[PDB]
């Protein structure tokens, strides 16, 4: 009878940056994605392993929101199996994945005129990530501050006028764990 | 830029085969799935298959299932279209056509190939 | 599958005026619902993904609207580069069928 909340999720007045992804371990309440359906707000809505017909016609055990803000042009890395930088250094997704990547448009809010140098995300690293790890060790990586010794990571600047593929997109990850175990989140 | 070509018109005998390719060049290719259409002459679409290039997982059209098989080539970024036991009716223009670069939504297509006629 | 049909598949009004396309559907699309533009020779192009968000570059002549299952794609001003074929899509269910279509001719 609970309705989750998807809103301290999705409506949130400010999101963790790449390198650190915030997470919600939501459970126990039925799940009403009719407030994500009836939206034209939301640039993607792609439903992995599951179709979005279907959403509200299921029962899971979990269900894992992962917020982070990118950039626009480097939304298509959150899905199993891209790379880059999003996707090696910052936040990786499992092949195995069966979730709702649901990535909208915020340049009114996370953009000032001269800059904003608070959103961040790890540039270099040794290896890529492993599915849903983070890692938040900001020690000057090495391939002091000066030659071959550089800071591992790098702000975005997001001023209104970037273009698109350089403006904030909030990201929001649904992660759902199809486990043969009682059922708590339902639709 | 996001230039999808496709082979030439395409003429066919009735219980044959041919396979229809759709070169890709320009972006991600591994980050795109490759839908695909068909037009019959002045009238409506409807679907046939998409293809996801990584993986390889396909989806088709319930009037397809037996007929289109498709398959993905992650050397040269194609995505070919392989029809078997064809027939008169099954005569149309085949379309390629990946989603928009920024929208995300899984249906919309935003970038189509040329178009290939089959006989 | 959803099937969706159109007003009028040949459609005749004069030059300058205004269309008013529109396009049924089955069964409930939340919102999802696009329209394209073929004109004879070329592969359609996306005009508005949404009900109501025009891709970038076309221009603001054409305005879609509607609610419920019923829509409707309407233009300002015809010209003579917009004498097209304005086929229907849903993306709600995957038979994400066009509509069969409405070929515009000048009266």
């Known amino acids: 009878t609970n309705l989750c909340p998807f809103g301290e999720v999705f409506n949130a007045t400010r999101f963790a940056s790449v390198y650190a992804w915030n997470r919600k371990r939501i459970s126990n309440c039925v799940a009403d994605y009719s407030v994500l359906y009836n939206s034209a707000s939301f640039s993607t809505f792609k439903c992995y392993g599951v179709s979005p017909t279907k959403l509200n016609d299921l029962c899971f055990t979990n269900v894992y929101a992962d917020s982070f803000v990118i950039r626009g042009d480097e939304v298509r890395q959150i899905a199993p199996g891209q790379t880059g930088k999003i996707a090696d250094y910052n936040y990786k997704l499992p092949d195995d994945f069966t979730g709702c990547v649901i990535a909208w448009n915020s340049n009114n809010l996370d953009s000032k005129v001269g800059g904003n140098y608070n959103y961040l995300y790890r540039l270099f690293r040794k290896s890529n990530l492993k599915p849903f790890e983070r890692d938040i060790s900001t020690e000057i990586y090495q391939a002091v501050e000066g030659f071959n010794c550089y800071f591992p990571l790098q702000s975005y600047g997001f001023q209104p006028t970037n273009g698109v593929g350089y403006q904030p997109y909030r990201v929001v990850v649904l992660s759902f764990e199809l486990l043969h175990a009682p059922a708590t989140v339902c639709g | 830029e996001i230039q999808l070509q496709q082979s030439g018109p395409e003429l066919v005998a009735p219980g044959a085969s041919v396979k229809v390719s759709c070169k890709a060049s320009?972006?991600?290719?591994?980050?795109?799935?490759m839908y695909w259409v068909r037009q019959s002459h002045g009238k409506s679409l409807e679907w046939i298959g998409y293809?996801?290039?990584?993986?390889?997982?396909?989806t088709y059209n319930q009037e397809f299932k037996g007929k289109a098989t498709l398959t993905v080539d992650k050397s040269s970024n194609t995505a070919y279209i392989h029809l078997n036991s064809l027939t008169s009716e099954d005569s149309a223009v085949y379309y390629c056509?990946?989603?928009?670069?920024?929208?995300?939504?899984?249906?919309?297509?935003?970038?189509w190939g040329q178009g290939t006629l089959v006989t | 599958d959803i099937q969706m049909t159109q007003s009028s598949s040949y459609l005749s009004v004069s030059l300058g005026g205004r269309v008013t396309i529109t396009c049924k559907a089955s069964?409930?699309?939340?919102?999802?619902l696009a329209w394209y533009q073929q004109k004879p020779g070329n592969a359609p192009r996306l005009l508005i993904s949404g009900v109501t968000n025009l891709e970038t570059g076309v221009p603001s002549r054409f305005s879609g609207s509607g609610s419920g299952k019923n829509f409707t794609l309407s233009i300002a001003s015809l010209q003579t580069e917009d004498v097209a074929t304005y086929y229907c899509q849903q993306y709600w269910s995957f038979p994400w069928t066009f509509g069969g279509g409405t070929k515009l001719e000048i009266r």
């Open positions: 069964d409930h699309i939340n919102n999802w």
């Open positions: 056509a990946k989603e928009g670069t920024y929208y995300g939504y899984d249906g919309v297509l935003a970038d």
């Open positions: 293809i996801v290039p990584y993986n390889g997982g396909t």
């Open positions: 320009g972006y991600a290719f591994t980050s795109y799935n």
